[PDB]
């Protein structure tokens, strides 16, 4: 069974955006809790 | 809001001669229960008595102390 959104231009872009958001959040959190002191 | 209050510090105007700040001293004094003296060595944290102990060179108080001398 295909996903409902299969065959959409927006799928790769939304996945990318979610990954970029996540990476940014992770780096910022890491900096504050590990390197900011 | 801040981690802690100003915590001002007040020093001396003339230092005591034999005192090193933050180092307790010990002085020899006598405490009497029935009118009979028992030698005691008492710790003076900063010029204030804080802990009574026994005087090893005093007969009837060789290090050991009675509860009444401790609770003075």
């Amino acid at each position: 069974m295909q996903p409902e959104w299969s065959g959409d231009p927006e799928v790769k872009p939304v996945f990318l955006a979610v990954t970029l958001t996540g990476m940014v959040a992770f780096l910022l959190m890491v900096w504050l809790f590990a390197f900011y002191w | 809001c801040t981690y802690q209050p100003r915590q001002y510090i007040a020093p001396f105007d003339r230092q005591p001669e034999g005192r090193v700040p933050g180092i307790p001293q010990y002085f020899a004094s006598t405490l009497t229960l029935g009118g009979y003296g028992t030698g005691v060595l008492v710790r003076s944290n900063e010029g204030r008595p804080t802990k009574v102990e026994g005087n090893p060179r005093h007969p009837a108080s060789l290090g050991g102390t009675d509860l009444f001398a401790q609770a003075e």
Binding site: - | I9, P21, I23
Partner: protein, 218 residues
């Protein structure tokens, strides 16, 4: 289509995304506030009642640290100077000066000068300058260039982690004594080798012992 407009799909997805971003932002703000310089009073020159300048007396007049903080190497407490030490110079120097009036107000009455404590520990930490100084640590890798400080500020927040970083890795901060010598001392390029050699020579205990609770807290 029954009860919602066309853009409700985008609005709902963006609302979820914004809610997650807001939660992350709130966590970040809380952490930053609790690790801020304003909260911990770092790099803030606390104004003093008598306006004493370490730069003038140390860097210009040239007075040793132990002339004022005389108990630093013998007890846990670095003796804050008495008015007697202040008056040994100012009975003759800069007498009849409006900014030395408070000092002259003391030494005539028994009232002390209420300095504001810059470096403050929460009375369950039990620090000791004596062992530290004697073991090859100076008030430059431990306090800052106080020699050039018109108004003393807190160089770093005294975190539990800060103390534990150097208690665990003391070979990056240990110096060859001369710790009271003017803090013009600069660590050499081969700090690691010299630090290891000094750790071996002074007999500094491994982190198995220096990170125990009753080392600091009692």
């Amino acid at each position: 289509a029954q009860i919602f407009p066309r853009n409700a799909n985008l609005l709902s997805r963006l609302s979820i995304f914004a809610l997650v971003l807001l939660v992350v932002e709130g966590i970040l703000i809380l952490g930053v506030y609790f690790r801020s310089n304003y909260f911990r009073q770092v790099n803030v020159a606390i104004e003093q009642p008598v306006a004493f300048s370490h730069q003038l007396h140390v860097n210009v007049v040239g007075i040793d640290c132990r002339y004022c903080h005389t108990s630093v190497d013998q007890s846990y407490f670095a003796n804050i100077p008495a008015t007697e030490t202040c008056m040994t110079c100012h009975s003759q120097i800069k007498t009849y000066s409006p900014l030395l009036e408070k000092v002259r107000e003391s030494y005539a009455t028994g009232k002390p000068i209420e300095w504001v404590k810059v470096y403050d520990l929460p009375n369950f930490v039990y620090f000791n300058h004596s062992i530290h100084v004697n073991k090859g640590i100076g008030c430059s890798t431990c306090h800052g260039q106080v020699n050039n400080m018109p108004v003393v500020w807190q160089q770093q927040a005294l975190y539990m982690g800060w103390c534990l970083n150097c208690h665990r890795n003391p070979e990056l901060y240990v110096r060859p004594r001369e710790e009271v010598y003017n803090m013009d001392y600069v660590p050499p390029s081969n700090q690691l080798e010299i630090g290891r050699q000094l750790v071996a020579e002074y007999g500094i205990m491994p982190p198995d012992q220096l990170t125990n609770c009753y080392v600091c807290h009692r």
